[PDB]
Ligand binder design. Sequence first.
Ligand SMILES: [K+]
Ligand SMILES: [K+]
Ligand SMILES: [K+]
Ligand SMILES: [Mg+2]
Ligand SMILES: [Mg+2]
Ligand SMILES: [Mg+2]
Ligand SMILES: [Mg+2]
Ligand SMILES: [Mg+2]
Ligand SMILES: [Mg+2]
Ligand SMILES: [Mg+2]
Ligand SMILES: [Mg+2]
Ligand SMILES: [Mg+2]
Ligand SMILES: [Mg+2]
Ligand SMILES: [Mg+2]
Ligand SMILES: [Mg+2]
Ligand SMILES: [Mg+2]
Ligand SMILES: [Mg+2]
Ligand SMILES: [Mg+2]
Ligand SMILES: [Mg+2]
Ligand SMILES: [Mg+2]
Ligand SMILES: [Mg+2]
Ligand SMILES: [Mg+2]
Ligand SMILES: [Mg+2]
Ligand SMILES: [Mg+2]
Ligand SMILES: [Mg+2]
Ligand SMILES: [Mg+2]
Ligand SMILES: [Mg+2]
Ligand SMILES: [Mg+2]
Ligand SMILES: [Mg+2]
Ligand SMILES: [Mg+2]
Ligand SMILES: [Mg+2]
Ligand SMILES: [Mg+2]
Ligand SMILES: [Mg+2]
Ligand SMILES: [Mg+2]
Ligand SMILES: [Mg+2]
Ligand SMILES: [Mg+2]
Ligand SMILES: [Mg+2]
Ligand SMILES: [Mg+2]
Ligand SMILES: [Mg+2]
Ligand SMILES: [Mg+2]
Lengths: 63, 386, 129
Amino acid sequence: MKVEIDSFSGAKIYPGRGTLFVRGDSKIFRFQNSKSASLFKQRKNPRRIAWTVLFRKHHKKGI
Amino acid sequence: SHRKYEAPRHGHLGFLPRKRAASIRARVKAFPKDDRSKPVALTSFLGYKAGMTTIVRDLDRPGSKFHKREVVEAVTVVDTPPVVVVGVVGYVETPRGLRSLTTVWAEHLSDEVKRRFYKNWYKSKKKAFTKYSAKYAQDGAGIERELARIKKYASVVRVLVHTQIRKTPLAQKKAHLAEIQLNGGSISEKVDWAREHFEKTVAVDSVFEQNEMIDAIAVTKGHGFEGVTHRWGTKKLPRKTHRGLRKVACIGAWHPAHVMWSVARAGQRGYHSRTSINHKIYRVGKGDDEANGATSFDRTKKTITPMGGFVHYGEIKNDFIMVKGCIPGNRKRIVTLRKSLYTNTSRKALEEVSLKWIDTASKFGKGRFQTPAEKHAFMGTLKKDL
Amino acid sequence: TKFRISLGLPVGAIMNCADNSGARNLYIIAVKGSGSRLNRLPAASLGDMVMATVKKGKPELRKKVMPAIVVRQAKSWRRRDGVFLYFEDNAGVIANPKGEMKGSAITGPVGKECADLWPRVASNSGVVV
RNA sequence: UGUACAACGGGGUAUUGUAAGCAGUAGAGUAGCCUUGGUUACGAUCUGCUGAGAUUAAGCCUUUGUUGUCUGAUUUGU
RNA sequence: GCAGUCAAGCGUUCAUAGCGACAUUGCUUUUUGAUUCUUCGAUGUCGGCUCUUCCUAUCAUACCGAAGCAGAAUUCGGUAAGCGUUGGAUUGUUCACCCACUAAUAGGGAACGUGAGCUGGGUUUAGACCGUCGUGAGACAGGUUAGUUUUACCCUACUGAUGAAUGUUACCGCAAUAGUAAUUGAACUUAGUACGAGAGGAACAGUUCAUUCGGAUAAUUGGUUUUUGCGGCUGUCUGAUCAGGCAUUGCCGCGAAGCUACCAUCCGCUGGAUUAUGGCUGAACGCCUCUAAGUCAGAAUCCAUGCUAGAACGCGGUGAUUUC
RNA sequence: CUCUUAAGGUAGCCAAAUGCCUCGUCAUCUAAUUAGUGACGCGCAUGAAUGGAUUAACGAGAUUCCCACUGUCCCUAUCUA
RNA sequence: GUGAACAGCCUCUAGUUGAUAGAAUAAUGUAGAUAAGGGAAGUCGGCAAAAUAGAUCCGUAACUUCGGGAUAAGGAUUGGCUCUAAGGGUCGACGAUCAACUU
RNA sequence: UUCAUCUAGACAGCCGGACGGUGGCCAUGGAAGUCGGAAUCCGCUAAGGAGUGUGUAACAACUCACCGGCCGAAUGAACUA
Ligand SMILES: [K+]
Ligand SMILES: [K+]
Ligand SMILES: [K+]
Ligand SMILES: [Mg+2]
Ligand SMILES: [Mg+2]
Ligand SMILES: [Mg+2]
Ligand SMILES: [Mg+2]
Ligand SMILES: [Mg+2]
Ligand SMILES: [Mg+2]
Ligand SMILES: [Mg+2]
Ligand SMILES: [Mg+2]
Ligand SMILES: [Mg+2]
Ligand SMILES: [Mg+2]
Ligand SMILES: [Mg+2]
Ligand SMILES: [Mg+2]
Ligand SMILES: [Mg+2]
Ligand SMILES: [Mg+2]
Ligand SMILES: [Mg+2]
Ligand SMILES: [Mg+2]
Ligand SMILES: [Mg+2]
Ligand SMILES: [Mg+2]
Ligand SMILES: [Mg+2]
Ligand SMILES: [Mg+2]
Ligand SMILES: [Mg+2]
Ligand SMILES: [Mg+2]
Ligand SMILES: [Mg+2]
Ligand SMILES: [Mg+2]
Ligand SMILES: [Mg+2]
Ligand SMILES: [Mg+2]
Ligand SMILES: [Mg+2]
Ligand SMILES: [Mg+2]
Ligand SMILES: [Mg+2]
Ligand SMILES: [Mg+2]
Ligand SMILES: [Mg+2]
Ligand SMILES: [Mg+2]
Ligand SMILES: [Mg+2]
Ligand SMILES: [Mg+2]
Ligand SMILES: [Mg+2]
Ligand SMILES: [Mg+2]
Ligand SMILES: [Mg+2]
């Protein structure tokens, strides 16, 4: 098996966890859970969502 | 006049009455047919349902769309520490059925099983089996005489075994005692096996093996008094209905001038004895074996227990049986796993399953990490620790 | 020939038309191979053949019953690999009873189950999942 | 009178999403002062300490900690 | 309404493959009548919804017999009610009709089942309008619109739940009896094969799925939120801050647990005896004969296996049985 | 051409809240319509202040369709008092 | 106070804290809510519920008795903060002083 | 019950024959015993129908009425209740 990456939060998605969303333009989004799925549907920016990998990278957290 | 639109009846009339089971431990009402050429072996085992998890495995099913592909499957974990054999019961056959002729107990019984014979153990004098243990005074002549009777009689032999509930995380502390049929030849050697195993433990790996189809016998989760809508699955009445809609509209014709047994009625739901068959054993894991949750593909040294423990159960520290799918009964409930009563050869049975990965993420939420080391590696250093 | 997919398109559902036949939507009136149960609506899933009408579209395509094949569901369904997935919209393509498309092109992605079930849809498809 | 039980505490797990406070050559600008390049004041908000803080069994898991509890009533004889 | 008997004829020939005139014998009480026996100190008067059971005159599924059965399809018939028999447009409607799916969209009963189960669209109180009729008040199986659907806490029935009594108490069991369940389809392959001039075109075995149903279960996904758990927001109140109150759960996002969904997943057994029917041997009736004696196979049937309950007046084994 | 009345239903309108036959016929609306609408009219039994026909606006009046919306339903589940 | 507002919501003065209570949280209810995908397929009938909603700006059809229809239909915007501009009184083309809100 | 066959060999059973005149005449595109009408004959004869069926486009060919070889005593038909 291959561990996927959350399209919104960057969390590791193990087999069976979360959901997969195929957009109209055939782009694939993987969500580890309904929290990240709902934030994506609300169109929140992961760069503004303070607990996401993208936010932490942009804000130089941990490195 | 006729029903005017056909529909199947709601519910199964063969699972009646929908009453509470007389015991929290569901009785094994049928044991596998005895083949008296095989060695003496238990026909069943006692475990405690710990919880469920998920596994990934390559499907071996030629002709299937997912042949040689990876499937995610739900599995149930049953904490099964070795059972202690504490007695043997002999059963003679009669024109009125099987009848217990005599029971021979082990010389020493643990407090676990002794508690089973007591409603108030804390304030009792624990006199149980104190005079019986005196039958082993010098040579055990009475014990040998009773065993000789069982050999001379008792076309059916069952061993009395009790769980080691103290090895489970349960607070009950009172062991579960049950009869397990001894399959294998020569009732004489059945009795010899039982006597030689008095006061001794039998592990689940000596009863069950990987890829084996077994049956789970357990009392289902209780739900108390239930209306017809959820007890039987009847149609909800329209929103306009006066006097309530979670009902059956017509509970009978004018004649017979009686409510019939076949009509759905409100009553107790759950806590029923159920025997569900054909559950494939995915793992026969051992507590003394670390990397219980590891596979040949994962190699991560982790146990079967999810992060934070099995929710409402605890940690698996003993031998455990992982069966495919789900089984009757809730977590912490005593279940009986019995060998299949027939020889299933359908390519669903006889399929050799090799787990690639066992989920150990927390079941107390949307668990993201299989191991605390993985949580450490992903999260980096925190303020409290790490 | 396909595993069970959570039905998300009961009778009366209107899905977008993903082909270039000139129809804009398909209105489900039936599902081929659907069973019978009192009060239960026939419902379709990805890859199912339905009977549909064109509510808006070319007038020559409107006002008649025609076979269609569901290529996008938008109702979450579980694949055997444990993936719960769903599309952004419900979409289908006009076909004949033998599964041959009336159009010649697919707009948007197509479910893998539908592509595997219907070779003509797979041949005319672009991105599959 | 214990691999006892309980109430707290600790840890794990999980949820949310970065606490209070302090500080800042952050801040659109604005109003003073005089040594005229700063200083004083107001300022949504921003940044750092801070994936912090808070909650976490009430039907989560675990516990070498702390504190305590452990003979009250009724009835039953072949 | 349904089913027979006869057999002039139809069926190219051929009464009976399938039909069948002229006649004639019946059955049924899901038609409508006939009657007026019960009910007028009152049995709630249509239809639908819901739910259970029963019947078989069987639509489908099982196994078969016959054909004007080459195959495919179909038709007639037998055992068979085990199992299923649908989603919709119009109409109060029963009925009807059409669209569509399907293996099939069979017919019926149960006070024309079912209103202290619902609903109240219709009929069938009182309001009102129209048409015809009447001088008129008014009439109208003519049309139209509006029009209160009451009570169970009793007994029984049913569903679940306790429980005295057997020396006491405890554990493990047995199993009389009662119930019982699984269902149907598709694809691949067999096989473009058998068959057929060709057109067309199977079936058994095997495999993968699916439908309807049922029993569980909550690992995952989804739903649910008083976790009022965290955060955000409005108005106001606590001098400001911090931290809070109220807005009858203030609202919003997320939300663990629990519960739960063909909206999730798992599981749903194999032996015997039979029906129709096809046979064996074999007389009756030196032949023939599945039948008379005997006997083989055989259906979704039956009975068991298995599954549920465990007789609270069925039973067994076993432990301990009170110094005072 | 006849019989015939007080006059013989005119202008209009219609299967209309008035048409039995009738779910009239045609068209439209739908996959399908005893519904709706538009037409037609030998109209059981339409019709002129017993008012005819039509009408903007208005209507807790009757009705049909469409968009939005949804637990009315598929098919139920959960929560609070 | 918010707000157009005697609306709704919170508060001051004043008044009350009166409805039989305690414990649990089964079914079925009454009242209040939510719900994946579909969206009236339910039903006699969209009953019930949901959706919409204030204000500013834009835009607004048929038909009409010219008065309406009309908020037709259909769109956009809205918080906080720091500013900017315009709109006055009184007194002596300017100066002094004073002041409240609306855009 | 009635009528029949029968040790001068009943029925059933196995095997042989089942001719000639003659494809009898006619209707038909062709019909020879046999889709159909009429004629219902004889020679050989223990015995053979211008035909009991199968079969042929018509033939041809099997088949039966009829008579025989073998066995040896009861058998057949239509009726009545
Ligand atoms: K009466
Ligand atoms: K949940
Ligand atoms: K506040
Ligand atoms: Mg969730
Ligand atoms: Mg029926
Ligand atoms: Mg269920
Ligand atoms: Mg009501
Ligand atoms: Mg969990
Ligand atoms: Mg219905
Ligand atoms: Mg803690
Ligand atoms: Mg009465
Ligand atoms: Mg009555
Ligand atoms: Mg019958
Ligand atoms: Mg009735
Ligand atoms: Mg009643
Ligand atoms: Mg009533
Ligand atoms: Mg009624
Ligand atoms: Mg009414
Ligand atoms: Mg009236
Ligand atoms: Mg008059
Ligand atoms: Mg207050
Ligand atoms: Mg509050
Ligand atoms: Mg024979
Ligand atoms: Mg017999
Ligand atoms: Mg008993
Ligand atoms: Mg006229
Ligand atoms: Mg008219
Ligand atoms: Mg009209
Ligand atoms: Mg309609
Ligand atoms: Mg009039
Ligand atoms: Mg104001
Ligand atoms: Mg919804
Ligand atoms: Mg939604
Ligand atoms: Mg919609
Ligand atoms: Mg409808
Ligand atoms: Mg309907
Ligand atoms: Mg209607
Ligand atoms: Mg309403
Ligand atoms: Mg208008
Ligand atoms: Mg507008």
